[PDB]
Amino acid sequence: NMSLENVAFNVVNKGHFDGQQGEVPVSIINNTVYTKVDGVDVELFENKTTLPVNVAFELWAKRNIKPVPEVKILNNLGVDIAANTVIWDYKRDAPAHISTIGVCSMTDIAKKPTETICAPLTVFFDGRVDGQVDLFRNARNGVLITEGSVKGLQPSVGPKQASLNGVTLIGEAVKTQFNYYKKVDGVVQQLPETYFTQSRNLQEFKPRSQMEIDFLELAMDEFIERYKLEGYAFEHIVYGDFSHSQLGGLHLLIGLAKRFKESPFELEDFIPMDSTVKNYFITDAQTGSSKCVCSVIDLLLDDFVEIIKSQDLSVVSKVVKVTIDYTEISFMLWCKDGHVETFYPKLQ
Amino acid sequence: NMSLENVAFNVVNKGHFDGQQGEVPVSIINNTVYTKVDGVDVELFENKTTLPVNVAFELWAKRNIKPVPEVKILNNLGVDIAANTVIWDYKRDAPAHISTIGVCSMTDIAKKPTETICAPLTVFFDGRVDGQVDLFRNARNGVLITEGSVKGLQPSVGPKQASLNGVTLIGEAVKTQFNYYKKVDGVVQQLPETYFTQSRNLQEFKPRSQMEIDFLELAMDEFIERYKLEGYAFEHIVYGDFSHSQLGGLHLLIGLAKRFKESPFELEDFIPMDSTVKNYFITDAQTGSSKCVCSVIDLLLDDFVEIIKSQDLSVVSKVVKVTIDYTEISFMLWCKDGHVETFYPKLQ
Amino acid sequence: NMSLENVAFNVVNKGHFDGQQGEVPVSIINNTVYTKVDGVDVELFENKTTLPVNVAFELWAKRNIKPVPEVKILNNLGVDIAANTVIWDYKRDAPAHISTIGVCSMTDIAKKPTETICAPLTVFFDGRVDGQVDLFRNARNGVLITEGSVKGLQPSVGPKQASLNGVTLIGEAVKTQFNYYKKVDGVVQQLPETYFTQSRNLQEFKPRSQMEIDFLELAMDEFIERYKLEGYAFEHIVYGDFSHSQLGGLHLLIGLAKRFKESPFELEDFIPMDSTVKNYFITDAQTGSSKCVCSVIDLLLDDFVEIIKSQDLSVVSKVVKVTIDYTEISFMLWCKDGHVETFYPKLQ
Amino acid sequence: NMSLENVAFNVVNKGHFDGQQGEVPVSIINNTVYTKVDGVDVELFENKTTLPVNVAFELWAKRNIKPVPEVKILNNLGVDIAANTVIWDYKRDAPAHISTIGVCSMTDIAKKPTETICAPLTVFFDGRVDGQVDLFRNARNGVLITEGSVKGLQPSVGPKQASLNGVTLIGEAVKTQFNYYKKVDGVVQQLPETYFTQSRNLQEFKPRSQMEIDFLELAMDEFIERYKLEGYAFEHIVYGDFSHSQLGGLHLLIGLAKRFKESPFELEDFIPMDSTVKNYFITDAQTGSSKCVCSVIDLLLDDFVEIIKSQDLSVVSKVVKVTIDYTEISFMLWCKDGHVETFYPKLQ
Amino acid sequence: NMSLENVAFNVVNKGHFDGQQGEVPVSIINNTVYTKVDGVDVELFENKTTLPVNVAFELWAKRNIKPVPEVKILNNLGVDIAANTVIWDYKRDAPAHISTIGVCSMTDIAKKPTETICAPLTVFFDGRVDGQVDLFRNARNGVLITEGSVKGLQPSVGPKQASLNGVTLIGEAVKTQFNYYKKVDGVVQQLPETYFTQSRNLQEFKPRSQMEIDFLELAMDEFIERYKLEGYAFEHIVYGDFSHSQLGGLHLLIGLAKRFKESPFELEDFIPMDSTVKNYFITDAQTGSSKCVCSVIDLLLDDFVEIIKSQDLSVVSKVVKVTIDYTEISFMLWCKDGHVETFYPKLQ
Ligand SMILES: O=c1ccn([C@@H]2O[C@H](COP(=O)(O)O)[C@@H](O)[C@H]2O)c(=O)[nH]1
Ligand SMILES: O=c1ccn([C@@H]2O[C@H](COP(=O)(O)O)[C@@H](O)[C@H]2O)c(=O)[nH]1
Ligand SMILES: O=c1ccn([C@@H]2O[C@H](COP(=O)(O)O)[C@@H](O)[C@H]2O)c(=O)[nH]1
Ligand SMILES: O=c1ccn([C@@H]2O[C@H](COP(=O)(O)O)[C@@H](O)[C@H]2O)c(=O)[nH]1
């Protein structure tokens, strides 16, 4: 007895779809789902997706409510579709994937990932669910996460954090650290050695190393002195330069965090999705310095220092590829006379 | 178990709601309901009501598919709601009544007409359905139709025609002639003597008496002579006067029918609902004669002749009351020197 | 360079997309596309699909404007997608296929049908377009039409009619008769022997054999006598029985055509798509006889006579399979004492 | 001269409907009302209700702007409709009641509450308005609030707080403490002895007793020691248990307030309306502990202590009914060996 | 190659329209623009204007991204339209002006401001753009801003602050202080001597003089003593009176700022646009004091003191006109016995 009214019954009574029997009366108006409570309509769901309102509602109700990989990781690994779950993209307020497998009769392309239609697609498999490791072994294309070893398969250790109901966190009551595995055209594929972004935000930014603690606490000249960063242009890249009409540098989230605590600024997120590199149209409220495309990455400051200090500074300009969140991020490196002028990640 | 997808299943497989088990995939977009058939969306219902699309869809699917009284009759008798059915108003493409009894969870005010909330409402009961005659005997306010006698109740003979799936017809394979009964505050009413409108349309107008055959076949002066109608202004009232910029008369549907077969004209139906008197903004294509409010009634011509020949003609102008379709219709009667000048029904 | 404004320019100047350079100003509102002509907005396209309005507009403008197979034929042959064209489904006012190849950036899954993603799909190829016969020879799954012989392939002769801009016709100035070929998993199929429906309509029904001329001209008993059809229940199946509240029979379009020219009736097309068998909720205006699901097929009368005269009549009821428009249509055959009682196609 | 343009004139000039004469030009687009100011459109109202945009606008403009009972109190007392005012529900951004009396021609069921249609409805009456106490005495069903005694009527003292323009507050410049009276089927009905919720929110939470001050200030073990709460499971019920994947307890708002000041968490309000018990899908950001249905009530901590300490702890599990905000709230009581395991309110 | 897809390419790649070549696929659904990124739709723009979605998107993408005059200044100077730019109104989330010149083919009334259609309109010209000073000299009606002197033209020094991407700021890395010039019917027009509002907001309010520092820091009686404000009713006008049900005074933003830091309140901005005087429906959360129309102006406190101390206090009531932001603001002045009772700006 699968139906719109049953999905709404579960939302009202269990907070999400829980397979319980029951029905409530529902009204659909434009892109919103309502239910009647004691004679009046109460909004249950406002559709912000490009799917029909009643379909989006069901996929949202059926969203995965355990820690799952952040969407940027799944995108970077080429995931097209999930096996028997919905990965909800809270940055876009929409399903991470257009089609489903065994979830919803309007969006399903199959009931099980073993069906031939799924073979060309990179299917996401969750080893925490019974049977899905074995489905991955039979799939032609897929990405698998597990909490432990899988016999014979060589793992890649994933990021420490995961997404739980749209909250990115490092789990203490739950496990958010997964092993990752990937298959392409029937062959298990070695995942590259990689850095991971830290998935923090401006307001609640917390340092995760003594170097980041020092960066937030010390003055610019003292931090650069203590960590021996002369000639690496941190004044520009990390602290940002607000003296000209065009804003200089400011490409590390921690540097935005330091500035924000002292002086507010505006960030227009003109491509609002989850991605390893984020691009903002930034306007500094105190000075009027601004920049249309300011690429910002949230690396651990120790990792960025490691990355920049390993570069050859003898070329005027080159593109440097660094593996981050399993993808190749291009950095622009500008040097003059053996010193860095700038070093910044580019719009993906 | 009631459900949007089950309603759609019945529409696709049975043509309407038939209580069958099953489900089909449904999409709701732009006030329209779609179902997926072999990978593509097929429109099942476009909402033209002021109700939510999924609610209107369910009421439409649950519409009564037997011959039922035309909505104008039910309105004239003061019907507020129907017992355990939906009277679909095909002139408005919407339910004839705002609420339901035992039909739909979003619109129901009760499951049975015996509930207290129904006592003050005038409930429509259908004697063809088992138990409904006795429900009428117990109800405080109600209208009852039957096909035959009811013990201890005097009937009022209704019109010959009824509505079947939006087609108004005099039934030959099905009975469309009902007895009518009405109760107000527990008291059986004596319904008034009444004429009935004939519910015909322009393009397929069919005469229903020898006088109407003669009207369509004969020239104007031949007809007026044969039925001795000199001095009743039929030339104006029934045939129409297209000689001046304002169109004179033309208040009987048969007169429009006669003109239409020879010469086309435009009728703007600016209040599009079912009613005993209809008002049109008429523009005559041949002459350019037009009129903003032309009230038009489809009485059998013999009945209209009886009415106008039964009036006193000694006063310049007065209001004449005629019970038609059980309601009192006001006509304006204008006379000069003992003859009719015009006689027309008024917008109710 | 593809563009909304360039699509509109072609529609305004060429009647459809013709690859011409230019732009016009465009407004998008209420699922409708407008263009500005001398200071006022003129509607160019109203979206009736479940796609975004600007995407539906582009696919409509790029529709195939040569004679093409009717959508029911393509559906019956399992076609999923078209090579480098859009088959517009005029019954649904929408694209016949969800995805495209080399047509439109929002809906394309590939630029050429040789890409790997197309291998499992049944691709429609048009031998009138240069190169497409050879694309079919290399494709894994496909349907091919041609106007003449293809070296080394046995053809299946298709119907006489095809669809040109939504008009189904037997071409006189253009060829509408195609050879058909089909491949499944790289293997050329032998297409089955099949009847074809005639794709006619009620108001303009034209007989296509002497038997059909006789059916329309002669009275019922004269016709049944002349073609010796006693005992095949044509009175019920083809002519229809309007004597009871439920309408009996009336399963052949020619029988509806004959009734319609004498007496009007209403057909509610409750699944409005192109299909070999059509299902209507029918209400006869003269009698009030009606039926919720009346399955109707337009076979040449001679073909229907051959089919029913080729059945064993010794069992009360059974399912009869008839290949029509390349698909297996199930008919219900009911018999009594060695004669037909009824014989009707089922909702597919 | 009541009209859309006059309602907008009052909104623009007086901040709400004030019965002033005048008109401004208005544009309606989708669900939004605009007015022209110096050549450009300015948004006056965005419709979030299920009513037509222009109707919702008028009811909003006509909202009651004096302190009124919170909607949860009116709901708990069975109020269906208000006499000659609109109680705006700021939690739902919509009218608290679907119909009106003497407010708006699209929603009125009557002009005065004495009309027979209002007799079955529980009408809300405001003794601050001239004549409404006497209307309550004549009403068959109703709820009355006053600021002082009504002769012969036995009062119930209401909550200290009321809602003023969506701000819940205990009035100092205005009176927010009302006497309550209720009638059912013509008979005055004794309102039950009741606790009241405190209607506070997480961010601005202020303690209202020394015990609440101590709870916010002291550590868990010290507070439980000082107020002798051993064996009543406050560690679970009030402080919450974040050590397992499922979040334990956390059912009092003050406990959420204490946690929030130290560590943020996410509350999905999946039924967003005013109610005595609120239910949240909660995710703790620090630990990853979460729970789909966490029922939360804002009682004065002294009241909850009084409630739980009066319970019999000798049964493994029972349902305990407590009157709160005039309604029966069900609590689940789990005990083991004479101590509380948990005690929590259930989803209404 | 100007098109919807090209506008979207620029937004995605450059943060705004930058005249770059390229295209991305775009979906329009209701009032929102999406683009496809790696198989899924990402929202680029939600239309809150009364223009068609695709037009509003292009004007937004083409918005001026240098410091520009606040919209209230342009409105006060009678500006109808801008020369070859779009002034985006971030308070209304819409273009400041309905038509354009050389921006967008759907909204342009001309390509250049020299065209005859522009002569009756007050065109905004930006002396920072090559050629626009000379266009102003040739225009019949216009407003010009420059950073420096224009030969022979007598300047008006504008406000210190300007709007950069919706951020109002006094520029340090950029110039926000302009000279202003205006022409009416071909004649340069002397701009009046004027005060300027300070364009601050409640949360981030920063004092801009020692008097404002003292007002925020000192107690009411001490501030009034130090600055000799006895008899000017500052207790009412600036500090506000919260003792009665109607809120008294509170007409200077700095006084709202002082109250807000101590006790929160609600401001309903019922005409949400940029204007020299703002009007709020205010509800004080601590007391319940409220007022439907509370007019609030953000003058430097020193300027307001200068204004009020120059008034003649010998009349019971008069209207006082003060030039502010180049417009005449009407103040109500009430006096009794040579002292101010109140002095407040009126709804523009
Ligand atoms: O993808 C990009 C392109 C540019 N920039 C910023 O914009 C500046 C100027 O870019 P360009 O004009 O040299 O391309 C760069 O130095 C850098 O700060 C980014 O952050 N990301
Ligand atoms: O309800 C109305 C009012 C007017 N008329 C037509 O309009 C003419 C002029 O009406 P009046 O302008 O004299 O009211 C009438 O003679 C009659 O033909 C109607 O048909 N119905
Ligand atoms: O798919 C169907 C089912 C039924 N019928 C019509 O409805 C009658 C009654 O069907 P049933 O109620 O016996 O299934 C049949 O004899 C036939 O005329 C159809 O045309 N198509
Ligand atoms: O209406 C409900 C149901 C459950 N719970 C919480 O969920 C836990 C587990 O519920 P159940 O799985 O025992 O029903 C309860 O102990 C309680 O913390 C609520 O807060 N409210």
Ligand SMILES: O=c1ccn([C@@H]2O[C@H](COP(=O)(O)O)[C@@H](O)[C@H]2O)c(=O)[nH]1
């Ligand atoms: O445009 C207006 C009108 C009134 N008021 C406030 O409302 C009070 C009462 O206004 P009235 O009822 O005297 O018009 C005024 O003293 C003033 O505080 C304003 O702020 N702005």
